[PDB]
Amino acid sequence: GPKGPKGPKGKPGPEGEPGEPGEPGPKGPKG
Amino acid sequence: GPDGDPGDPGDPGPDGRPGPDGPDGPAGDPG
Amino acid sequence: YGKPGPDGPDGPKGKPGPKGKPGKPGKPGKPG
């Protein structure tokens, strides 16, 4: 008796973490 | 016959989405 | 031949995303 078929490929891994927060927006122009 | 071999590992997950926006800048100083 | 093999493991976690975009510019200051 030969070996059974190899099992299905695993499912895709988790999505990566989101990046770190962007830099603060600049101050508006002076009045 | 013997059971088949374990399947291959799944694909790597997709790289993460962009980080959240930076905080909005403050209004400009008074004149 | 024998039974089908077990499912393979989940893949590895993806790489972290890029840095966020900079915040919105502030509104114009008041004349006062």
Defining key terms:
heterotrimer, A: 31 residues, little secondary structure, 0% helix, C: 32 residues, 0% strand, rod-shaped, structural protein, collagen
Quick overview:
The complex is a heterotrimer of chains A (31), B (31) and C (32). By secondary structure, chain A is mostly loops.
Oligomer: heterotrimer
Q: How large is the count of helical segments of chain C?
A: 0
Query: End-to-end distance of chain A, in Å?
Result: 86 Å
Kindly state the percentage of residues in helix of chain A. Answer: under 10%
What is the molecular shape of chain C? rod-shaped
Largest interface: A-C, 31 and 32 residues
The portion of residues forming beta strands of chain C comes to under 5%
Helix/strand-derived category of chain C reads little secondary structure
Q: Tally the helices of chain A: what do you get?
A: 0
Distance between the termini of chain C: 87 Å
The total count of strands of chain A amounts to: 0
Largest sheet of chain A: none
Number of extended strands of chain C: 0
Query: If you compute it from the alpha carbons, what radius of gyration of chain C comes out, rounded to the nearest whole angstrom?
Result: 27 Å
Q: What would you call the shape of chain A?
A: rod-shaped
* Helical content band of chain C: under 10%
Structural class based on helices, strands and sheet pairing of chain A: little secondary structure
Strand content of chain A: under 5%
Furnish the topology, listing elements before pairings.
The complex is a heterotrimer of chains A (31), B (31) and C (32).
Chain A: no helix or strand
Chain B: no helix or strand
Chain C: no helix or strand
PDB class: structural protein
Keywords: collagen, triple helix, heterotrimer, structural protein
Assembly: trimeric
